[PDB]
Amino acid sequence: PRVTVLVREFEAFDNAVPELVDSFLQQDPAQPVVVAADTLPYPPLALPRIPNVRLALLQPALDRPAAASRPETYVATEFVALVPDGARAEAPGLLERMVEALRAGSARLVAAPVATANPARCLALNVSLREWTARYGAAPAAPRCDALDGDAVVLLRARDLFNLSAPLARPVGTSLFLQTALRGWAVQLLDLTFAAARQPPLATAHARWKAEREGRARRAALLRALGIRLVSWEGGRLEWFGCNKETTRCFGTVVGDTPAYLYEERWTPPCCLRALRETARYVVGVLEAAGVRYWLEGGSLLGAARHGDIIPWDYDVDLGIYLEDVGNCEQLRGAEAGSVVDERGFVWEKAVEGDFFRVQYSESNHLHVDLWPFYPRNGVMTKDTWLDHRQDVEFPEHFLQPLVPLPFAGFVAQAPNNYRRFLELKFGPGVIENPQYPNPALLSL
Amino acid sequence: PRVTVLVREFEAFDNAVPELVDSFLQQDPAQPVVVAADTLPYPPLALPRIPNVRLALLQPALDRPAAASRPETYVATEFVALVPDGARAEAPGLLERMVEALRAGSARLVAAPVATANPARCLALNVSLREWTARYGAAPAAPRCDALDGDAVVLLRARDLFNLSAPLARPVGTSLFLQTALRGWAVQLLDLTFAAARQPPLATAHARWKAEREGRARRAALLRALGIRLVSWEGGRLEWFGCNKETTRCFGTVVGDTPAYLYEERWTPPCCLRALRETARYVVGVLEAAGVRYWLEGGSLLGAARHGDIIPWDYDVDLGIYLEDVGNCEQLRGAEAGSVVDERGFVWEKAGDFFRVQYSESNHLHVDLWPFYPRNGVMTKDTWLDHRQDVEFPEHFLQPLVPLPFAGFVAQAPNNYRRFLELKFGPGVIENPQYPNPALLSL
Amino acid sequence: PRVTVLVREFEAFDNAVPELVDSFLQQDPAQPVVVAADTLPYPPLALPRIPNVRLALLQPALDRPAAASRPETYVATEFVALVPDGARAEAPGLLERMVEALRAGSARLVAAPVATANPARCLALNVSLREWTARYGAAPAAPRCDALDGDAVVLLRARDLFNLSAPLARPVGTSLFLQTALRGWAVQLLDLTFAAARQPPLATAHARWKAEREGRARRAALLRALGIRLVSWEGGRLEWFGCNKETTRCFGTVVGDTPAYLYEERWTPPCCLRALRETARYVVGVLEAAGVRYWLEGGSLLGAARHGDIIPWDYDVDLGIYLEDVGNCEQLRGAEAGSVVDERGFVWEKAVEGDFFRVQYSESNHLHVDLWPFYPRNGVMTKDTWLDHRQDVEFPEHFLQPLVPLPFAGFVAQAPNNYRRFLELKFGPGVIENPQYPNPALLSL
Amino acid sequence: GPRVTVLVREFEAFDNAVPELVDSFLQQDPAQPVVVAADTLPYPPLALPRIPNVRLALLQPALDRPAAASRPETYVATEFVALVPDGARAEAPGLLERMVEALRAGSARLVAAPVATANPARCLALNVSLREWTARYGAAPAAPRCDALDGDAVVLLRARDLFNLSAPLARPVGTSLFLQTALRGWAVQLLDLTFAAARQPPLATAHARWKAEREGRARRAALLRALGIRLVSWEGGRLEWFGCNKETTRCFGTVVGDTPAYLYEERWTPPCCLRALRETARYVVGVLEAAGVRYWLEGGSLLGAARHGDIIPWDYDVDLGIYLEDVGNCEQLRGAEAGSVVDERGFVWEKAVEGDFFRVQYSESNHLHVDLWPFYPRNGVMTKDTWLDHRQDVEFPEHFLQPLVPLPFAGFVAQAPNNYRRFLELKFGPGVIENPQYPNPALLSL
Ligand SMILES: *[C@@H]1O[C@H](CO)[C@@H](O)[C@H](O)[C@H]1NC(C)=O
Ligand SMILES: *[C@@H]1O[C@H](CO)[C@@H](O)[C@H](O)[C@H]1NC(C)=O
Ligand SMILES: *[C@@H]1O[C@H](CO)[C@@H](O)[C@H](O)[C@H]1NC(C)=O
Ligand SMILES: *[C@@H]1O[C@H](CO)[C@@H](O)[C@H](O)[C@H]1NC(C)=O
Ligand SMILES: *[C@@H]1O[C@H](CO)[C@@H](O)[C@H](O)[C@H]1NC(C)=O
Ligand SMILES: *[C@@H]1O[C@H](CO)[C@@H](O)[C@H](O)[C@H]1NC(C)=O
Ligand SMILES: *[C@@H]1O[C@H](CO)[C@@H](O)[C@H](O)[C@H]1NC(C)=O
Ligand SMILES: *[C@@H]1O[C@H](CO)[C@@H](O)[C@H](O)[C@H]1NC(C)=O
Ligand SMILES: [Ba+2]
Ligand SMILES: [Ba+2]
Ligand SMILES: [Ba+2]
Ligand SMILES: [Ba+2]
Ligand SMILES: [Zn+2]
Ligand SMILES: [Zn+2]
Ligand SMILES: [Zn+2]
Ligand SMILES: [Zn+2]
């Protein structure tokens, strides 16, 4: 015996795990079987009390050694077969068939759908940790996959499963293939099918609703724990798991111009980018309706010139405006006498710090558009207040007459004319073609 | 004679860990030092990036192997010293001395106070997983101790620390000694003192208020994760970490008359028992106020007779009442039309031919009320449960009723209640406690 | 007892280091392992990326602190085991047993062979820095050795290894025991054998050949860097690493008559002396066959009188000749017209400075014999030029009438009669019995 | 008690004024700590005063010395270290603590005083990019605050900062010190204090200077190679190269797993290697345009052109597509099928191992190359008979080549498929231009 059946995805209140376990022992009484749980499942499972059937409780406990919560402790065979609840062994010799498939193939995982209502389908999957995004889609090399959707027995070497960081994190159907796809591993969907339980679990609308609410709750906690802020299907059907109008932003107070996600070797969370685009769009719309001359500035102008979007590691949006136009905007003139929360939840405020305005996504989510007011004195756009940035600099007004439409972050914003020049004056030649982080620093990148 | 300094207790927003680490590096530039954190601390700690100083991130990650979060894999030496933030090495050799004490003494752990505003004090500590309770007190054999309260450098063998199930769970001061005391290990509180940092962390009242709040949240999550519902102290102070009026009870629906906690070799969570005793005292009060004749029944009577309280694995309270006084109680009158939530949050229902009073709308810990009526001097009812002890009984057992301490108050019980309990449960029931369904699980 | 495995001796292009590391991890998953290299090995070593296995790069780097290239900072354990490529921990607890022998014995190093085609041998070793010589032999008190030859696991305290000046210079088999034997330390060769790799490295004849080539290059660079000119073995076999006919001599131009090696508290390099003795022999043979009367002069005669050889810190060879005889010698005849390279590559020249001749070992190697022509005036040998040496004096011709045989540099040379009186006349009384450096006012014995 | 250790590292053994240097500092304070550092014992002898505060630090390994003997911090007991070049002399008393006081009261971690030689220190700007293997020098925008110095200066900094560098005394210190300090974001303040020149300066003849300069340039070239600086520039120009060229091998060995060695070193392609690829691309394009072979930028080269008009900074070759029916118009290509062909300009044209493609190597020794992939139109889809394990090696509609479009690339104008943006996304996926990635992300990520 070289395969250990391991059952992780089931619900204590309604399962067919005893039928599952029995079905395998009917084919081999010596079959190693591990049912894994965080706490002792209740009502009792009453699995057969034989040495090859073991219940693995994986949460830490005051009375148990460190090994007791490590799943590899309970597996002494070369391969592990992850079996979902609802499956049943009916035809004999099917785990051996799966081993021979995995031996002969080039994929580190092999899988056989279970004949449930939701049998496994083959999926493509890329994990971008820099972008906190998991991108799913149809599998162009089926039956060679990056991930599975639905019910399948998945077999792989124990050494591969248990060297992952979160081998049994729930839902397995999500956490396993996120880890295996990131490592460039593939799973081969075999033309073998496991039968379904004769008494399938969760066979009522109410039990299914309970299971799905808990399943979705575990998935949401799993993606947040692992830094997946966004799930997409074919670039759409977007599923968010980050910040929003009602939460704080994902990273909070930046020190040394280097936000926390850079030290995590990632870029700006996509929920944060989404909020910045929406605030930029809203603020631009407000200034255009009020008759405020604005133009993309600093990193926003640079990002618009390079790829027409926010630079993917940047953390705010900066606009220049004519200072004499400020009185035209109600939120702005309100923001010079104190903090203003407008009809749509955006907070307009004048950070007395550097003599500029700041518009935050909401009272709790402090992703902001900074507005830098400019006034001409002897033909140059210049303010008697600056900060320690190379690109906080005076510039001749002719860059602003006329202004130019430039795509930026989903809409068309205004830019200085000859913006390519303009950007080279402020950042240096070749800046559009040579990306950079905001402050190297005594470390990496 | 090699010892790794291991730092776990610090706040990312306000810490003195750079000074801590640099102070040890002053005594030995190659001192092995491990800073452990769940997530990457920000603002950056900006530790010296030298091979002997390492940052151990303990949470799972899509792009790291299982080993990357296992702390023993960062520690190669025989001994480890847990150093709290705010501490510092000044005089040389203090770790070597603590090693010397460990090898000469008999305690598996040695410790040295840090001269902060909360230097470590010695405490006794008794852990009862079966009762979800940890009990602290003053240490009779100090400086031999079960646990510590306050700041100390703790040194032990790495094989000892890392074979624990949760060696670095926060707060370490709570988590560590719960696990070591449960094993019968002692900590010896040595005479050595570590100096405090010169620029101590949490210097403003605002900052320590933040730290203590987040410290309190971590401790509550820790105790819930590891099955401590109650912390008690000599002197009577009680710290609750379980259910209450606004939560669910701690255990789900009971199958086979055998609750989930018994299969975990544990008894009723002490918070659930507290709720039951509170519901018992309230319902009794309402019934006496309304003039309803009640007596303790079933397991409540048994526990009252045996030790004047709820049987420690029991999960409800049972009272008999006279059929005919039901109408005297407003809540009971209403409970027959439908579910009544009275002014104190209790939920009166009828459903069975008995009444049920639940602690609250969310907490379904309940007192069951069993109405009986006399037929021929025999107390009877019209529907029956599949319980040996659910039977008719002579009414003279109610004529009269006797005062009996139960669950903190004086209840009413049948006269000759030991004979009463023997009639329903069988002989010797008081002296021979048994789980509710020994066919499934027996005590 | 905690022990860090430290791997230094391997080749990037062909090794069994992953197998080595893996085999120790199979006995303790948290085994601390340090792989040391001067540059990042490419192709990638692909060690398990786990915190207890670390790669230490011993190169300077602009973005790393001093500590990153100092290997002691990677070793936290009391003990360290140097393990060569091609070895494996197959038996549980071999390092522990090596640790116990170290504490029980008196040797600072303990060693275990590995069952390769060349398991470690026990050797004696004396190091003489002053003579630039390392002398190996059979070990008189085996299993206690000064040095090993072949593959072994070598265990010692980290404090002892990393207090050495060059703990990990390659080849470690040579470098380590030069340093430990010079310090009087012993290495006890235990009766413990580590296994060889299942796939040993260098399975082909081409890579086995390419490894020996880089090894010998590393070995020669090591001994030159450390000042070992000569390695000898019982059996007489000699390995040289200094002068030859085709290179320059080891030391540059001598100022103050005090060569650079003397200031380093060493004597003349053994290759330089060898060249001088072969040049003296050759020149004597030329002058004798030419019928040129010659005699041992200056420091050569003094050395001959003391012990029949060159003074061990001396840097040339001196012979006096009769001036009227130079025309008898073909090489001397051409030398007056210009530089002459003769049948054996020796270079005969008439010196710029003082009316004397000089014979260089070769065109590139300027170790030389100086020929001092004298002529008789009134029974007194004289010349028209004079050095600022006290022993550069006239002398009576009867000292040359006749000459006496005197062994020098492996052959029999002609010397003045009464050479004791001759030497004392030129150097002052007691010179034979009182060795002194050529310029005691700058550097004395 | 003195708080500065004078440290002398830049001098020549055959010709120096280090004895005069040491004596001048001892004349202001006879107890002044003075360290002279060398790899080997300097010969002729320096014959420094045999007092305990004057020490020779030999920084090479030795069979009879402890580890500490070759570490420079072993020789310094003071908080501060003054790096003093040969040719300086202390005549004004107390200058060393004016430098200590200036460094304490300022914000630069280094301060420096010029030495009044013929080459007095000038303030410089310096940007070090390890990823691009480049050191960019220029005029200092915020003088007297600098990133680097050129010329002779006493440089004072804390021992803890100097000796925590990886190569604190690597020669030339004028190069190695500031490459390390500028990489860390440290500044050096050129103070308004002057040190006097040696009364009898070293290297006073042309021949002595010529020997010193040849040795110095050899140490500088070895230093830059060891430290991974392939290119030095002054104001973007005056390029100075220390990498590969036409006569050497390329900088990185044979690539395995599509991931060259420089990626594992957390670096991008060496700039010498990129230069050779741009030269070979321009040459090969020039040859094919002259011979009448239709070509187009392909693969990573087309992708780099569309994004920023150059080779992608971590890419290792250039790929062009050609019409197979045009191969016969190029002499070098028709010879490539029969065997390897070195053309008159040193480029090597070969037909592939298997793969039915052509490879043009920069030179016989330097195997950076332009790969040429020929296709032909089956039913209007361009195809080849064999394929690669890469995602982007597929067929494509022929209309993407009727017409071809100009596109700037690598310093010249090359031909691209029309609508190259859509062409790129079909082969690589949507958004490829706006989202850059590495060749094998599962092994090594950007
Ligand atoms: C995943 O990434 C690959 C990159 O090779 C790309 O070709 C593929 O289309 C991507 N799939 C999704 C669904 O984004
Ligand atoms: C992780 O991989 C190593 C190498 O195969 C293996 O020996 C080890 O047992 C694996 N770990 C677990 C927990 O399975
Ligand atoms: C722990 O149990 C002992 C009896 O063994 C008891 O005396 C002690 O008081 C308990 N500990 C505490 C803190 O109550
Ligand atoms: C647990 O203890 C054993 C025996 O001392 C030891 O071998 C093992 O390494 C320990 N586990 C750790 C340190 O994680
Ligand atoms: C080493 O020196 C000892 C003592 O002088 C001597 O007895 C022995 O022969 C020497 N061994 C070798 C190999 O030269
Ligand atoms: C050198 O030995 C001493 C013991 O005297 C020890 O303290 C020190 O750590 C050692 N140095 C190194 C680099 O191991
Ligand atoms: C160095 O980098 C800065 C910041 O990008 C730039 O402004 C400056 O021009 C650069 N200087 C040189 C000489 O490259
Ligand atoms: C590096 O700096 C620390 C102070 O931060 C100092 O203790 C240490 O000695 C320094 N290292 C060296 C080699 O000078
Ligand atoms: Ba910006
Ligand atoms: Ba009960
Ligand atoms: Ba001589
Ligand atoms: Ba390419
Ligand atoms: Zn966000
Ligand atoms: Zn409770
Ligand atoms: Zn020699
Ligand atoms: Zn190159």
DSSP state string for B326-363: GGG-HHHHHHHHS-EE-TTS-EEE----SEEEESSSS-
Cα B48–chain centre separation? 41
Helices and strands (H, E) in chain D, number of each type? 10, 25
Are C206 and C267 within one domain?
no
Q: How many CB atoms lie within 10 A of CB D240?
A: 15
d(CA A142, CA A120): 12
Cα–Cα distance between A259 and D201 in angstroms, integer?
53
Interface check A388 vs B, CB under 8 A: no
Q: Tally the domains of chain C.
A: 2
At which residue do the structure tokens 């420690």 appear?
B312
> Within a 13 Å sphere around the CA of C8, how many CA atoms are in the beta-carbon half?
23
Ligand 2, residue A72: give the atom nearest the CA.
Answer: 13
**D15, D63, D232, D267: best mutation site toward chain C, by most C Cβ within 10 Å?**
D63
Give the type of residue at D102. Answer: A
Rounded-to-integer distance, Cα B220 and Cα D189, Å: 54
Residue window 62-101, chain C: list those with CB within 8 Å of chain B: 64-65, 67-68, 72-78
Q: Which two tokens stand for residue A441?
A: 């620093």
User: What Å distances lie between residue A168 and A8, A165, A173, CA to CA?
Assistant: 7, 9, 10
**Nearest C-alpha neighbor of D398 from the set D338, D323, D287:** D323
Give the three-class secondary structure for C231: strand
Beta strands in D179-304 (DSSP E): 188-190, 196-197, 231-234, 237-241, 295-297
- Beta-bridge partner residues of D89: D196
Element (H, E) at C372: strand C368-376
Cα torsion A307, A309, A312, A318: sign: positive
Report residue B374 as tokens.
């006399």
Name residues 247-276 of chain C within 8 A of D (Cβ): 252, 255-256, 260, 263-264
E-strand ranges in C242-344 read: 294-296, 317-322, 340-341
| Contact status of C103 with chain B (Cβ, < 8 Å) | no
Q: Among A24, A15, C335, which Cα is nearest to A6's?
A: A24
Say if strands B109-113 and B187-189 run parallel, antiparallel, or are unpaired: parallel
**The residue count for chain B:** 443
Could you give the 3-state DSSP secondary structure of residue A25? helix
C223 HSE (CA, 13 A, CB side):
22
Nearest to B318 by CA among B338, B303, B308, B334: B303
Phi, psi of C382 (to 5 degrees): -140, 165
Q: Which residue has the tokens 């034979």?
A: C432
In whole angstroms, give the CA distance from residue A255 to residue D299. Answer: 40
Instruction: Say how far apart CA A255 and CA B46 lie, in whole Å.
Output: 13
C177 and C234 in a single domain? The answer is: yes
- Kindly report the three-state secondary structure assignment for every residue of D34-91: EEEEECCCCCCCCCCCCCCCEEEEECCCCCCCEHHHHCHHHHCCCCEEEECCCCEECC
DSSP D148: E
Count Cβ atoms below 10 Å from residue B309 Cβ, excluding itself: 16
Cα dist. A275→A17, A240, B148 in Å? Answer: 44, 12, 47
End-to-end CA distance of chain C: 49
Determine the residue type at D116: A
Nearest to A133 by CA among A252, A254, A265, A233: A233
Query: Inter-chain contact C40–D264, Cβ cutoff 8 Å?
Result: yes
Q: Are B257 and B208 within one domain?
A: no
Q: Which residue does chain B place closest to A255, by CA atoms?
A: B43
Within 10 A of C308 (CB to CB), how many other CB atoms are there? 15
Chain position carrying tokens 């109410």: A206
Q: Does residue B269 share a domain with residue B220?
A: no
What is d(CA D103, CA D123) in angstroms, rounded to the nearest whole number? 17
Same domain, A90 and A135: yes
Binding region of C for Zn(2+): 243, 250, 271-272
Sign of the alpha-carbon dihedral angle for C53, C59, C63, C68: positive
Dist CA B340 CA D402 (whole Å) = 83
**Alpha-helical runs (H) found in A30-170:** 94-104, 158-161
Counting one residue from chain A and one from chain D, the pairs whose CB atoms sit within 8 A come to 25
List C-alpha distances in Å: D96 to D122, D154, D164: 20, 9, 22
Q: Residue D73's closest CA among D191, D182, D157? A: D157
Comparing CA positions, the residue from A344, A275, A357 lying closest to residue A316 is A275
- Say how far apart CA C265 and CA C277 lie, in whole Å: 22
Phi-psi region of A210 (alpha: psi -120 to 50; beta: other; left: phi over 0): alpha
Q: Which of A165, A315, A445 is the best mutation test for B, with the most CBs of B within 10 A? A: A165
b/e per residue, C146-170, with b = 16+ CB within 10 A? bbbbbbbbbbbbbebbbebbbbbbb
CA distance C194 to C116: 9
Pocket probe for ligand 5: among C123, C126, C234, the residue whose CB has the most ligand atoms within 8 Å is C126
Q: What share of chain D is helix, strand, coil (3-state, %, to 5)?
A: 30, 25, 45
Burial A168-206 (b: 16+ CB within 10 A, else e): bbbebbbbbbbbbbbeebbbbbbebbbebbeeebbeeee
In angstroms, the CA C362 to CA C403 distance is 30
My answer on whether D23 and D120 are in the same domain is yes
Nearest alpha carbon, ligand 8 atom 4: D160
Q: Which residues of A are annotated as a binding site for Mg(2+)?
A: 314, 316, 318
Examine the domain organization and report whether D276 and D377 are in the same domain: yes
B380 by Cβ neighbours in 10 Å (0-12 / 13-18 / 19+) ranks as middle
Contact, A5 vs A154, CB < 8 A? no
- As a dihedral over the C-alpha atoms of residue A260, residue A266, residue A270, residue A274, rounded to 10 degrees, the angle is 50
Supply B310's token pair.
């709820």
Q: Given the DSSP bridges, would you call strands B79-82 and B3-7 parallel, antiparallel or unpaired?
A: parallel
Mention every residue, 6+ apart, whose C-beta is less than 8 A from residue D388. D355
C52 lines ligand 5 (CB under 6 A): no
Q: Which residue of A lies nearest to D184 if distances are taken between CA atoms? A: A442
- Angle CA(D319)–CA(D322)–CA(D327) in degrees, nearest 5? 125
Residues A335 and A422 in one domain: yes
Looking at D227, D243, D259, the residue that finishes a domain is D243
CB contact under 8 A, D264 and C167: no
Token pair recorded at residue C369: 């014999």
The whole-angstrom separation of Cα A443 and Cα A437 is 12
Q: Contact B161/B78 with Cβ under 8 angstroms?
A: no
Q: Is the CB of C135 under 6 A from ligand 5?
A: yes
Burial of A244 (0-12, 13-18, 19+ CB in 10 A): middle
Cα-Cα end-to-end distance for chain B: 49
CB A342: neighbour CB atoms within 10 A?
15
- Residue D69 near residue D62, CB atoms below 8 Å: yes
Apex CA A239: angle with CA A237 and CA A244, to 5°?
130
Nearest one of D218, D186, D177, D160 to D84, comparing CA atoms: D177
Side-chain-side CA neighbours of D310 within 13 Å: the count stands at 16
Whole-angstrom Cα distance, residue B179 to residue B183? 7
Distance, in Å, from the CA atom of B378 to the CA atom of D80, rounded to the nearest integer, reads: 102
Please tell me the distance from the alpha carbon of residue C38 to that of residue C221, in angstroms, as a whole number: 15
Q: Residue D144 gets which letter from DSSP? A: T
Among the partner-chain residues C66, C165, C227, the one whose CB lies closest to the CB of D166 is C66
Backbone angles phi, psi at D168, to 5 degrees: -65, -30
CB A362 within 8 A of CB A347: yes
3-class DSSP state of A38 = coil
Residue in B closest to C158 by C-alpha: B2
Determine the Cα–Cα distance for residues C277 and C410; give it in Å rounded to an integer.
Answer: 8
Same domain, C236 and C250: no
Which secondary structure element, helix H or strand E, spans residue B79, and what is its range? strand B79-82
- CA nearest neighbour of A84 among A183, A174, A216, A166: A174
- Regarding whether C76 and C205 lie in a shared domain, the answer is yes
Contact between B18 and C41 (Cβ < 8 Å): no
End position of a domain, from candidates A242, A261, A277: A242
To the nearest 10 degrees (0 to 180), the angle between helices B205-225 and B172-182 is: 30
Cα A216 from Cα A241, distance rounded (Å): 12
C52 with C134, same domain? yes
- Percentages of chain C per state (helix, strand, coil), in multiples of 5: 30, 25, 45
Residues of D with Cβ-Cβ distance to C169 under 8 angstroms: 61
Beta bridge mates, B14: B11
Domain range for B129 is 1-242
Residue B233 burial by Cβ neighbours in a 10 Å radius (0-12, 13-18, 19+): middle
Sign of the CA dihedral with A243 first, then A245, A247, and A250 last: positive
Contact C30 B78 (CB under 8 A): no
Task: Name the residue with tokens 């120009």.
Answer: D237
- Name, in order, each residue with C-beta under 8 angstroms of C196's C-beta and a sequence gap of 6 or more: C86, C87, C88, C114, C115, C116
Q: How far is A228 from chain D (nearest CA, A)?
A: 17
- SS3 of B414, please? strand
**Method of determination used here:** X-ray
Reading the block at residue D163, the tokens are 């000796």
Query: Phi-psi category of D307—alpha, beta or left, where left has phi over 0 and alpha has psi -120 to 50?
Result: alpha
Q: Are D426 and D299 in contact (CB under 8 A)?
A: no
Q: Sort B376 into a burial class: Cβ within 10 Å, 0-12 / 13-18 / 19+.
A: exposed
Tell me how far apart the alpha carbons of residues C321 and C325 are, in angstroms, rounded to a whole number.
7
Closest CA to C126 of C136, C114, C116: C136
Listed in sequence order, the DSSP H helices in B28-168 are: 94-104, 158-161
Beta-carbon contacts of A116 under 8 Å, excluding residues fewer than 6 positions away, are A86, A87, A150, A151, A196, A200
Using DSSP's 3-state secondary structure scheme, residue B34 falls into strand
Resolution (A): 2.2
- The protein residue with its alpha carbon nearest to ligand 7, atom 10, reads D127
**Is D320 in the same domain as D229?**
no
Q: In sequence order, what are the residues at sequence separation of 6 or more whose Cβ sits closer than 8 angstroms to the Cβ of residue C305?
A: C406, C415, C419, C420, C423, C432
**How many Å from the N-terminal Cα to the C-terminal Cα in chain D?**
52
State the sign of the Cα–Cα–Cα–Cα dihedral C236, C237, C243, C244: positive
Nearest to C88, CA basis, from C118, C116, C109: C116
**Calpha distance A370→A299 (Å, rounded):** 11
Contact D442 A184 (CB under 8 A): yes
Token digits of residue D13 = 């053994």
Q: Which of C348, C318, C325, C287 lies closest to C408, judged by CA?
A: C318
Ligand 3 interacting residues, C-beta cut-off 6 A: B 124-126, 135-137
Centre of ligand 11 from the C-alpha of residue C268, in Å = 12
